[PDB]
């Protein structure tokens, strides 16, 4: 399965970094610290090609992890899940790892294909974890930059 290596920055230009074994946080980084951005492997999965939506999976290129959405106490939750890197990416990716990549207002939105109207989100505040959210004050828009280095 062919995928693209990228970094993601929210609509407030906050970069995404690892803060734990299974956690990401969003914060503004100085230009010289741009290399700290977590590297995603975005793969295109077999699925629902509705007008303006494309099914994707988001792996961490440098870890045996994928973003997935599950329920915890009736609440849709984002998590980083350990996988065996040799079996991934899969064309038929498991439902929990599927995100609908939405292109709107020249930006990216990642909706859980498991939880409609739930998106990969960041808070306005500095250095808070990345989560599943979406009235409201959550940031759901991102820009994708390609990895060259």
């Amino acid at each position: 399965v062919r995928s693209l290596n990228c970094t993601l920055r929210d609509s407030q230009q906050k970069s995404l970094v690892m803060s734990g074994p299974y956690e990401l946080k969003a914060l503004h980084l100085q230009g010289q610290d741009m290399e700290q951005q977590v590297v995603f492997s975005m793969s295109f999965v077999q699925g629902e090609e509705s007008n303006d939506k494309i099914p994707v999976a988001l792996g961490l290129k440098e870890k045996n992890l994928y973003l997935s959405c599950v329920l915890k106490d009736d609440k849709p939750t984002l998590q980083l899940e350990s996988v065996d890197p040799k079996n991934y990416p899969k064309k038929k990716m498991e439902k929990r790892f599927v995100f609908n990549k939405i292109e709107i207002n020249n930006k990216l939105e990642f909706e859980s294909a498991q939880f409609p109207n739930w998106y990969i989100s960041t808070s306005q505040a500095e250095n808070m974890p990345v989560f599943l959210g979406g009235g409201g004050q959550d940031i759901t828009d991102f820009t994708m930059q390609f990895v060259s280095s």
Partner: antibody, heavy 118, light 108 residues
Framework: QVQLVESGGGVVQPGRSLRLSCAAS????????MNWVRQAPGKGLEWVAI????????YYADSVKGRFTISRDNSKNTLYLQMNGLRAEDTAVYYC???????????WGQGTLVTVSS | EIVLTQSPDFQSVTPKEKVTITCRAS??????LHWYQQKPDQSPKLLIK???QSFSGVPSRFSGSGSGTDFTLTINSLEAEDAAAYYC?????????FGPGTKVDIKR
Amino acid sequence: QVQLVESGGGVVQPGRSLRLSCAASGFTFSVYGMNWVRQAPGKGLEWVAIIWYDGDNQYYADSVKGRFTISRDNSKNTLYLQMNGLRAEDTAVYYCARDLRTGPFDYWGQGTLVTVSS
Amino acid sequence: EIVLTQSPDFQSVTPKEKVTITCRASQSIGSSLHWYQQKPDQSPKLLIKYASQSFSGVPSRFSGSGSGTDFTLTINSLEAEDAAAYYCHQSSSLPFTFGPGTKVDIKR
């Protein structure tokens, strides 16, 4: 330029405790993960512990899990290692090392020798 | 925990020789495998990051390749100063681990 300077090594009795320090300069210390790696005389490198950039999380090797405590102070650009229940096996040169994206250890200190003996 | 093994334990190399040393992971680690150099009573230094990517200031003779479980470090024309211990380290998952190392010396 990136500089890492360890201090605090010395001779310690087994069962007692010792604090290691590692002062950083030449980079934004508050946004990089920091690690301790040790090497016993004539042996291979052994990863000891990691502390993520903000210090809200850490991780230890099984060999030191529970006996050792990794910490940092971002205002003083300093990395710490608190060693308890020190034993003869703990005799090693302790290096502090910065990691890039929780990946490679890109910059290393000069190391501090910890001697555990009666 | 992911275990790393290195082959050989010791390598004798004539200066100007192209030399290759290996590192094997007990589980698939993608490309999250790093190479370090360590001279005796000297601090280790990073050579190659993420299997095959260069690190600033490292001489061009050092080269890495591999993915999954099998990794190699190449010294394209060994120089006298290259006699040292060579370690691989994985960052795919916690706890982080180092391989046992390969000691490279000068053949005569």
